[PDB]
Amino acid sequence: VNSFSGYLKLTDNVYIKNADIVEEAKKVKPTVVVNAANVYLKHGGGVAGALNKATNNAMQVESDDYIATNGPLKVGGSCVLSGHNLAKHCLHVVGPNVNKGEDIQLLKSAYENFNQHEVLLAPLLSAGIFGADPIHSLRVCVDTVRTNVYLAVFDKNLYDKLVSSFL
Numbered sequence: 001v002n003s004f005s006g007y008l009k010l011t012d013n014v015y016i017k018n019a020d021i022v023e024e025a026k027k028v029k030p031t032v033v034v035n036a037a038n039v040y041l042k043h044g045g046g047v048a049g050a051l052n053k054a055t056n057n058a059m060q061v062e063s064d065d066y067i068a069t070n071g072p073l074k075v076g077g078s079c080v081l082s083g084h085n086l087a088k089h090c091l092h093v094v095g096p097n098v099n100k101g102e103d104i105q106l107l108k109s110a111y112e113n114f115n116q117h118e119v120l121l122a123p124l125l126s127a128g129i130f131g132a133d134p135i136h137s138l139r140v141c142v143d144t145v146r147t148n149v150y151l152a153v154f155d156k157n158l159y160d161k162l163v164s165s166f167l
């Protein structure tokens with residue numbers, strides 16, 4: 001038993017809700033919140049910008065130190081950093097950005113990072129400003145992630161669509 005409420009169960013291990021991931025992290029305080037990161041951990045907009053602003057820019061400060069030490073992530077890769085006031089840890093995961101021409105097949109590799117964590121609160125990778133089809137992203141999620149994932153979808157219209165079209 002865990003503290004996630006209001007979710008619709010999609011599969012044995014995938015749950016979905018219409019929620020603001022920032023507000024959901026603020027109330028659940030999950031062990032892991034997933035950020036829709038880029039390779040530079042520049043948290044300027046989208047989920048990333050929203051999560052970072054909720055940390056009063058502390059996420060960005062930590063991220064800049066990480067990059068200064070380690071260099072950029074790979075597309076399809078991830079790193080574990082602090083969750084600040086939102087979660088214990090933030091898993092920064094880089095899905096391919098279709099608006100940069102990145103290969104969509106890397107979306108499966110991105111979701112594989114979730115399997116290193118027993119439970120996660122997450123957005124749909126490569127959705128929103130990353131330009132991928134959120135329905136395809138949901139299919140890859142279901143077919144790749146084996147651990148327990150609670151998907152927060154900000155847009156109510158999108159949500160209702162994802163549910164109605166789910167197989």
Ligand SMILES: O=C(c1cnc2[nH]c(=O)[nH]c(=O)c2c1)N1CCCCCC1
Nearest residue numbers: 019020021022046047049050051053154
């Ligand atoms: O990007 C935002 C977001 C960020 N900052 C905001 N600041 C404000 O004053 N009003 C807003 O609606 C607002 C929205 N979201 C999408 C990704 C996370 C889910 C919640 C909202």
